[PDB]
Amino acid sequence: SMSVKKPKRDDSKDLALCSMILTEMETHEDAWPFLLPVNLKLVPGYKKVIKKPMDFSTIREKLSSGQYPNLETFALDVRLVFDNCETFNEDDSDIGRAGHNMRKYFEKKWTDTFK
């Protein structure tokens, strides 16, 4: 509350650390469905169904330009990529499997870096 604060966590490395996680996600072999925005002119249904499209290149641009106010807003966008993927793709498809794999990969790096 006013004049009553928890001890100050060092957040000065978060930006660099999120960039590093993001690099590891970009270079995973199962990243290909997520590297670039879904082409909304060529993929029927995507525009109407997925209210908030997100992809790794878009996260990278937001990160690099100071548009994430803290590391939780970064994690929300990463999770959104996989939540979108699950909304549009059957679990039993290459892309569906890619999204589950990538989500697991991310969540471990996240826990190990920050928890």
Side-chain angles (χ1 to χ4, degrees), residues 1-7 9-12 14-114:
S1 78
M2 197 186 321
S3 305
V4 182
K5 291 300 169 321
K6 288 197 196 54
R9 186 198 165 259
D10 184 14
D11 66 340
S12 59
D14 287 0
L15 186 58
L17 285 167
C18 289
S19 182
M20 290 170 54
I21 292 171
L22 184 60
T23 300
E24 296 165 359
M25 278 205 309
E26 291 161 339
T27 59
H28 192 294
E29 75 164 291
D30 302 342
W32 59 268
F34 313 111
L35 295 175
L36 299 175
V38 175
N39 185 333
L40 298 182
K41 305 166 187 293
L42 307 176
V43 182
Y46 208 87
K47 191 175 201 291
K48 188 62 182 277
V49 171
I50 303 293
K51 299 305 174 178
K52 287 178 64 175
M54 191 47 60
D55 70 285
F56 297 166
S57 68
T58 303
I59 297 173
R60 170 74 66 195
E61 183 60 37
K62 287 176 71 162
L63 191 60
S64 288
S65 66
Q67 298 181 58
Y68 290 118
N70 56 52
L71 82 170
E72 300 312 326
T73 60
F74 168 82
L76 283 170
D77 268 358
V78 176
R79 289 168 185 148
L80 173 64
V81 170
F82 309 127
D83 292 350
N84 291 346
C85 180
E86 278 198 59
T87 295
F88 209 80
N89 295 268
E90 276 296 344
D91 291 349
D92 184 15
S93 61
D94 297 94
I95 293 169
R97 275 187 291 274
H100 290 291
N101 285 355
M102 290 304 301
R103 183 195 297 274
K104 185 81 174 184
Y105 189 74
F106 171 65
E107 295 298 355
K108 169 109 151 77
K109 303 286 180 196
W110 191 249
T111 292
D112 290 356
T113 304
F114 295 118

